[PDB]
Amino acid sequence: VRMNVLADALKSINNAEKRGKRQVLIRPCSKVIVRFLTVMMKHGYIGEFEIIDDHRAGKIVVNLTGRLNKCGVISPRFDVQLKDLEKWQNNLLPSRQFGFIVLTTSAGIMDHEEARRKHTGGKILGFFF
Amino acid sequence: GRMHAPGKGLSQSALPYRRSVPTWLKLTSDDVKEQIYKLAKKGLTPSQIGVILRDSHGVAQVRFVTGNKILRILKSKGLAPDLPEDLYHLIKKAVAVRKHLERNRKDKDAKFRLILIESRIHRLARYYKTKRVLPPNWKYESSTASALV
Amino acid sequence: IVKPNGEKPDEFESGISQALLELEMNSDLKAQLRELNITAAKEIEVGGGRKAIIIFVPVPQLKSFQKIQVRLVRELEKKFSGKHVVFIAQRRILPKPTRKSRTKNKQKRPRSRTLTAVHDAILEDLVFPSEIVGKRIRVKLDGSRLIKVHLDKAQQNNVEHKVETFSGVYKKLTGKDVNFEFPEFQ
Amino acid sequence: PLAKDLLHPSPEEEKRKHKKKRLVQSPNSYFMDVKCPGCYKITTVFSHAQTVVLCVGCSTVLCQPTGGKARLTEGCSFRRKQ
């Protein structure tokens, strides 16, 4: 059965971007998905998206700009401390000039640079570059 | 897909977006409640009550009109089945297959289907035990299966 | 007529109560508003130099209000000149349960008394003459949102001019930007 | 393909799609107002009715169950509600 809706959303947007499409629809949606899409927003990788309210679970129509190389999930959602963040970004990111690791800390959902700024660790969700 | 069959079908009801009662529906919540009560006295499960109300009396969702689901309505006033209707129907099916089997001993498809039905019955019974609908000592027995139904 | 929860009626509440009494004196629907009992009222600037009236109808009496809402609204529009009037039920948002709290709640917070549910019901009552056919939340590049509401066309005109009044009301009592449009068909 | 607006589906292809596969799922059924040949008074009937709907004000059978949409009795007229 379907588990970890975030993985399905990220796979759908990744496959749509590999195919060159300008919009992708993701279903089901979630608050975790929306926060991940917003952190992807603030760095210019995705573009504007819109939530459709079906009374069961919303859908998301995501506009796509060709700037997205990869976006994926890391399951299981392992706990990451400040010390191990360097190892995680060395493993996942393609460079130190660009790319982001997304994590849930008690401060919210954000990229690894903001987590370094706020001096908080958490649980890894995924990555995009 | 199906729990006990290879098939993976997509066939179900699609409730509409609007949760408001239609204007043409002149029935009140109390009228729907009394209709439900007398239908239960006639000896129908909540499923049949919903089908009859939808087909003849023009109500789409009883929960939509009365703000409450059918089984909760029946249990609230008192006349509700001792064990849940889906479990009852599963037990009835198992009893029927067993009755067919005891005379047709050579049937091997019936034995397999019976085992599948018993597995479904056990899963449902354990779920209902965890939700305290059934007493913890409640167990499925082939000898008393016909007695239960 | 007004029965505030805080039992501190004000000038505009008194005006609304006396207006409702005058309706109970010279409008065949008197027998309805003699039983009914509003709780609060407010006047808020909406568009440029325009204003709108919000009446905080009690929740258990909401449907009885909605029975004759159209007549009440038209009569108050006549009495108040160009002053749009909207009836919104008064709903309590219990605080979200937090690990740093106390005995304020010995029972779990009901889902009806929640911020999201309260806001949805507020919008539904705000557009009562129409029906919410659809809802679409758009998230902009700056992180801001926009709730675009698809209303029935059956009853367009009735609230077609009332556009930007619901938006101002919602921006006031909710703080969220909302736009209204009518789909071509369903 | 490529640049196809999923936000603004066209009504014809939205009806073309499966009921559960639309932007928002909308059932394909409806409620009908059925008038008997002789009885003056109408009855509310489900389009995909699974029960033999009897005239509440007579003995006439209004519709017969089928695989999909219920079959109205010959002569019994009907109008779509809403």
Next chain:
Amino acid sequence: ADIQTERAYQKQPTIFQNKKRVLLGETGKEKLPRYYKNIGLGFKTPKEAIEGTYIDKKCPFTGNVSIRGRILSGVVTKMKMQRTIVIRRDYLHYIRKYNRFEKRHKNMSVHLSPCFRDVQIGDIVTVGECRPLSKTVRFNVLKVTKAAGTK
């Protein structure tokens, strides 16, 4: 409830029960005074222990035991011995090579006082460390909390 079921006479050692009493003060029985102590760490004394009549020298409230050291919690799994039960403690053990946990458990035999009645298989017990009470018992049940779906 008769409390004399052993070969020896059961009695709280601190209480003196043979104080001379004149016939003018012989209104039935003297209502034998009960010895009980308040164990610290913010644990309330059960009313049963105060108003009871059981004799239990291992009782944290009416016996000769001191609560000290570790305070733990468990789920009651078996109650087939006299005045002592078997509880289960579950935890996750981390494995660093895989960065992953594994579910582990260990049983513990803990003394249960007669002051805790209506203890069922499944409730939570807060136990506290004490001196060795038997070969395998080193804890005493200090608090009982019912299961999530009790009547």
Next chain:
RNA sequence: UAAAGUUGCUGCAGUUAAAAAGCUCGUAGUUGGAUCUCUCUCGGCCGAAGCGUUUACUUUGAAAAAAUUAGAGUGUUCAAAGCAGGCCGCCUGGAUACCGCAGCUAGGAAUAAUGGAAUAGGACCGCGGUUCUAUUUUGUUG
């Protein structure tokens, strides 16, 4: 030991190179869909008290042998070392970090479990009752 991504957690393979059980059911195990934005009392506005369901997680603080490792200073003639040394009696070291896991500690509340009313075996206000009981009574005694 690395090379060995030829033990694969990172990170391997199973159509034909070695490889998916003949098929289904099924206990344990593993995984599991949306959804919910601190106060009343005590002591000098604070210090106190609970308890917010409990955590996991994350950050901090404390406690944690020396040697070894990392590392600061220091021309052993250089270096591996050592913990010495420097100035014309004085001057100055003998640092710091790290130390899984479990156990203590205090912030955060996203994520993930868990509960809170549906025989009302409900919350809050006042009521009334039932019972037992500690002391007020009160220069004193009594």
